[PDB]
Ligand binder design. Structure first.
Ligand code: HEC
Ligand code: HEM
Ligand code: HEM
Ligand code: HEM
Ligand code: FES
Lengths: 67, 49, 62, 49, 81, 379, 144, 106, 109
């Protein structure tokens, strides 16, 4: 069990604006890719820009929440 | 040209000027090495000192 | 009136350049003995339970 | 002629222990210098350690 | 030859000074000083600042123009075709 | 000179080249970098020595040994950090010591300037070679690039390089050399220094206004000796504060990995103070022509005295001649950061632009600036 | 090195001794790296051993993720958590790369307390000596 | 090709003179000049009353630059008053060397 | 001293500590050991150098490396032999340079 402190802190930050906001583009990119995946395209670029804005929030919270 | 994300700066018990390390946690930190990293990644440069 | 602490001091010590030299040596002598001792506590008081000095008490002599 | 010379006032720069015109410098003199050296000898303590 | 004797010829120039003891190590350091810093900070600042200012702009502008190019691939050519 | 102890050994009359050397009255702190070079030089050689006693020059050994210092030797970690960072705090002085040179027009002294030029040109060589010695990754490839670059010479190039390498590549005997050089060579700098200082004693120092100071002189012992000490003190912090709290900040190269000739690091640069020179090079597409610029980069400092174009020495009185000069500062500062960047098209164009500007300021504008102002003041 | 590489399927495990100061970004690089393992985005492929992780430069790593919740038990007995476990390592390496760490900052403090004295004191003397120059007065009295 | 800008020059030159500090220390235009071999001989020929008053301005100049301070702007030099005293001597020495330098051509 | 090139760089007037340094007339060959020390000293440092470039200081390496010089390095055998024997020819000078010292009573300086 123990659930980790991590995952818990993960969801609160992704509940912020820019997280979900950029996350939209993921679906937008992917769903397009879902049709167009045959093309060279990938959403990895977008996945990244998601991750950055996410972790900046994640930065402060959990390291405190640790032992 | 892979986008390199940067690690967001976490607080660190030693981050401050006069801040020190926590030895208590280190004991654990070593225990992990002997458990896991023993497989492949080595450390040549340290003795049992 | 009595001479101010300096007015004494100057006549007794800093006049003769020998004493004026000697006083310096003993000065740094005691200085480092007290000075260094204080600096540790200040630092040590900052980190509590982060050093074996405190931590080692859990396991030392079993 | 030459005797027209007269010395400007430096009062601003002095320190008031000697400020008075009617006093013997020799009263303050002892301590007056006693401070300056205290600066010097103090300094050498630091270099020494 | 010897340095101090023959340096140059000067005439009728009078000098006055005090012992370093009589006078003080700080003749109104803060009061008389802090204005003096200002009036002599501005005389140069007209001549100094502008070029550095130009640099910082270029630096910022440079990064942005750099960023758009690389980071966003589907920018000029989007993923359609 | 009755029973003056300054005659009796003669050598002390040679030591009145300091104490009574007359000096101007008004001297800005900017003239303290006279001394602070020397002390940054001495503090090397010692701290430069006690590294040698535990260092070993071998392809197999060397890197292991530098490990061995930081770990096992009592007080072994401070020294290595004083030495390396004692290099950077050496240049940051050195440049200023040139800067004062131009902006007050001290270069008017014609010989002392030149010996100045060489004395620079040597250091840049030393502080290079040593940087190979750790034999880390950034040392290995950073060695090949600089040397192999020299092959540009039309005929003798191919041989001349292979000569220094003592082989086809940078393996052992190329290392052992660069130890024995980096060891001896500072002593020669110390040799020249006592020449470079000599001619100066004839004409005395210049002074900020750019006026013959003859009527106003001061003994050197009671006054400036303190001020240098005070100057000598502020260094220590600026050295200590860096070397003690934040070791690796200015230690910008991140690469301790033992050199593998097969792998290559993605980005490769010298340490910071070199960059701008290395930035000049990337500009020129043509290889051979490219190298000359880099060689011609510094040497122009020797030609500056021919360009004294005006009737007054200082730049403190010439607003124009002052106006441009600062643009040159940012221009260099630009080059620094430029070379420290990858070679994509937003950067590429820029360096090519800043390159021409650099010379254009020194080689055209500034010599013209003095002409107008002569005409202005009705000279 | 060969017997090392062979089992690693052509991959080469690096030495961990100073690896903190080796890679850019400091220790935070490692922690969030071991932290981050994502799902491959739509439209990207990998080699079998290679796993997609954003921080790693090529974003394909032959390291199989070591950590899951409670891989171990601690000598202490604190619950073993992917987050708790990870950080505890990322402190250790930081000590191996500079074993002098906790020792040096003593001087870092202790030199400052030292240095607070001198700079004013020295600056006290400087003005003392020069105080004769800055007190000058001139007058030009020609028989002219 | 300068007419109004010429009338703008004296706004700069006659006014430029205001933008170069040596007006503000008590110096003049002449006492500034970078010394050269001619000046070395140009100096010799100056009678006393000029010469010393060339010294004292300097001696007062330098000292001020030590204390980083600047004269009361009432007592600054006034561009309308510009003492050229150096020129009438200096053109001689430049002239008289031209002759030798040329006469020794051939 | 009109256009005497010995002034113009000052450093050359320091170099009239040699050329016009006046000397006695009668001087025995025994005073040649003034120079021959110097030249035996210079000839070291050079030949002392080009050994360094191939030498290595290690308990494991060092001896192997000196082997490596006499065998594999072009003209490598002369240098090592000039250096070592360049030491003995240094002392045999040096002692004489003291001997002249006593027997003529130069120590009066
Ligand atoms: C499955 C065997 C194995 C385990 C167990 C293992 N490693 Fe890894 N790890 C590897 C290999 C092999 C690489 C390098 C593969 C590559 O670079 O593609 C790697 C990558 C790494 C890297 C980054 C290497 C680089 O190229 O930058 C680090 C740091 C690291 N491991 C540390 C650890 C730590 C900490 C642990 C304990 C949690 C650990 N390893 C346990 C096999 C292992
Ligand atoms: C102007 C004088 C000197 C300069 C600019 C200088 C510069 C350097 C530099 C930049 C390095 C590499 C720094 C590093 O690797 O961390 C270095 C290393 C070294 N220097 Fe010098 N040094 C000087 C004098 C000396 C002297 C006099 C000696 C020997 C007495 C010396 C011996 C060494 C050694 C053995 C190394 C290798 C040790 C090491 O790099 O960790 N250096 N020096
Ligand atoms: C290790 C290198 C150097 C050392 C040790 C050194 C040392 C000195 C010292 C001690 C002085 C006297 C103090 C002073 O005049 O500021 C001096 C003067 C001077 N040096 Fe150097 N210097 C070095 C490099 C240079 C370089 C690289 C140049 C020019 C390229 C240079 C040009 C000058 C000039 C022009 C002066 C006299 C300036 C004046 O008197 O106003 N120096 N140097
Ligand atoms: C007065 C000057 C010198 C004297 C008296 C001197 C004397 C010696 C002697 C007696 C040996 C051992 C001879 C042998 O092992 O065959 C030796 C070896 C050596 N010397 Fe010097 N030497 C002098 C200068 C130098 C200099 C200036 C260097 C370096 C630039 C140098 C580098 C070496 C080296 C590396 C060795 C070991 C090589 C070898 O011994 O085979 N020596 N020297
Ligand atoms: S020489 Fe190979 S990249 Fe410039």
């Amino acid at each position: 069990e123990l659930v980790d402190p991590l995952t818990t802190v993960r969801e609160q930050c992704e509940q912020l604006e820019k997280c979900v906001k950029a996350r939209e583009r993921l679906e937008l990119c992917d769903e397009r890719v879902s049709s167009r995946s045959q093309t060279e395209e990938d959403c990895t670029e977008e996945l990244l820009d998601f991750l950055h804005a996410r972790d900046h929030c994640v930065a402060h919270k959990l390291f405190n929440s640790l032992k | 040209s892979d986008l390199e994300l940067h690690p967001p700066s976490y607080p660190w018990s030693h981050r401050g000027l006069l801040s020190s390390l926590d030895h208590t946690s280190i004991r654990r930190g070593f225990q992990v090495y002997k458990q896991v990293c023993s497989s492949c990644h080595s450390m040549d440069y340290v003795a049992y000192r | 009136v009595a001479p101010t602490l300096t007015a004494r001091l100057y006549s007794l010590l800093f006049r003769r350049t020998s004493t004026f030299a000697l006083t310096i040596v003993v000065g740094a002598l005691f200085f480092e003995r007290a000075f260094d001792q204080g600096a540790d506590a200040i630092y040590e008081h900052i980190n509590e339970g982060k050093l074996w000095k405190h931590i080692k008490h859990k396991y030392e002599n079993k | 002629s030459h005797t027209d010379i007269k010395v400007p006032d430096f009062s601003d720069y002095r320190r008031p222990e000697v400020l008075d015109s009617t006093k013997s410098s020799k009263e303050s003199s002892e301590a007056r210098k006693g401070f300056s050296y205290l600066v010097t000898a103090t300094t050498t303590v630091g270099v020494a350690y | 030859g010897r340095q101090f004797g023959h340096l140059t010829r000067v005439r009728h120039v009078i000098t006055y000074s005090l012992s370093p003891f009589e006078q003080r190590a700080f003749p109104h350091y803060f009061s008389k000083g802090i204005p003096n810093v200002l009036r002599r900070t501005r005389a140069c600042i007209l001549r100094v600042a502008p070029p550095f200012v130009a640099f910082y702009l270029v630096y910022t502008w440079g990064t942005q123009e750099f960023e758009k190019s690389k980071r966003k691939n589907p920018a000029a050519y989007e993923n359609d075709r | 000179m009755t029973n003056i102890r300054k005659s009796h050994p003669l050598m002390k009359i040679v030591n009145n080249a300091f104490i009574d050397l007359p000096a101007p009255s008004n001297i800005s702190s900017w003239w303290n970098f006279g001394s602070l070079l020397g002390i940054c030089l001495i503090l090397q050689i010692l701290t430069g020595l006690f590294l040698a006693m535990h260092y070993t020059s071998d392809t197999t050994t060397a890197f292991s040994s530098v490990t061995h210092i930081c770990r096992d030797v009592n007080y072994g970690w401070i020294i290595r950090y004083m030495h390396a960072n004692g290099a950077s705090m050496f240049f940051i002085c050195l440049y200023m010591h040139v800067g004062r040179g131009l902006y007050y027009g001290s270069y008017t002294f014609l010989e002392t300037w030149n010996i100045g030029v060489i004395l620079l040109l040597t250091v840049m060589a030393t502080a290079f070679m040593g940087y190979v010695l750790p034999w880390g990754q950034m040392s290995f490839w950073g060695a090949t690039v600089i040397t192999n670059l020299l092959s540009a010479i039309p005929y003798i190039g191919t041989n001349l390089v292979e000569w220094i390498w003592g082989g086809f590549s940078v393996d052992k005997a190329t290392l052992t050399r660069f130890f024995a050089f980096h060891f001896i060579l500072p002593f020669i700098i110390m040799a020249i220094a006592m020449v470079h200082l000599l001619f100066l004693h004839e004409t005395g120092s210049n002074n900020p206004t750019g006026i013959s100071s003859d009527v106003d002189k001061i003994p050197f012992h009671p006054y400036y000796t303190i001020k240098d000490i005070l100057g000598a003190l502020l260094l220590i912090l600026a050295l200590m504060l860096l070397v003690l709290f934040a070791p690796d900040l200015l230690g910008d190269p991140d690469n301790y990995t033992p050199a593998n000739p097969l792998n290559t690091p993605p980005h490769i640069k010298p340490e910071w103070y070199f960059l701008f020179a290395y930035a000049i090079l990337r500009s020129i597409p043509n290889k051979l022509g490219g190298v000359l610029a880099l060689a011609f980069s510094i040497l122009i400092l020797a030609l500056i005295p021919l360009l004294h174009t005006s009737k007054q020495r200082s730049m403190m009185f010439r607003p124009l001649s002052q106006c441009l000069f600062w643009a040159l500062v940012a221009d260099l500062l630009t080059l620094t950061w430029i070379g420290g960047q990858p070679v994509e098209h937003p950067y590429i164009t820029i360096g090519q632009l800043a390159s021409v500007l650099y010379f254009l300021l020194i080689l055209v504008l500034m010599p013209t600036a003095g002409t107008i102002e002569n005409k202005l003041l009705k000279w | 090195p060969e017997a090392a590489r062979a089992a690693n399927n052509g991959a080469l495990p690096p030495d961990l001794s100073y690896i903190v100061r080796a890679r850019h970004g400091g220790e935070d690089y490692v922690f969030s790296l071991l932290t981050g393992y994502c799902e491959p985005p739509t439209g990207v492929s990998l080699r079998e051993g290679l796993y997609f992780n954003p921080y790693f430069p090529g974003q394909a790593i032959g390291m199989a993720p070591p950590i899951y919740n409670e891989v171990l038990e601690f000598d202490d007995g604190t619950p073993a958590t992917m987050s708790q476990v990870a950080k505890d390592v990322c402190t250790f390496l930081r000590w191996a790369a500079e074993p002098e760490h906790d020792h040096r900052k003593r001087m870092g403090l202790k030199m400052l307390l030292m240095m607070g004295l001198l700079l004013p004191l020295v600056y006290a003397m400087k003005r003392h000596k020069w105080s004769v120059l800055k007190s000058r007065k001139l007058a030009y009295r020609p028989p002219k | 090709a300068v007419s109004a800008s010429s009338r703008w020059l004296e706004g700069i030159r006659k006014w430029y003179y205001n933008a170069a500090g040596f007006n503000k220390l008590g110096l003049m235009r002449d006492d500034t000049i970078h010394e050269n071999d001619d000046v070395k001989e140009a100096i010799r020929r100056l009678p006393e009353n000029l010469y010393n008053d060339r010294v004292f301005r300097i001696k007062r100049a330098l000292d001020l630059s030590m204390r980083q301070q600047i004269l009361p702007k009432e007592q600054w030099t006034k561009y309308e008053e510009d003492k050229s005293y150096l020129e009438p001597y200096l053109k001689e020495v430049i002239r008289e060397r031209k002759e030798r330098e040329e006469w020794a051509k051939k």
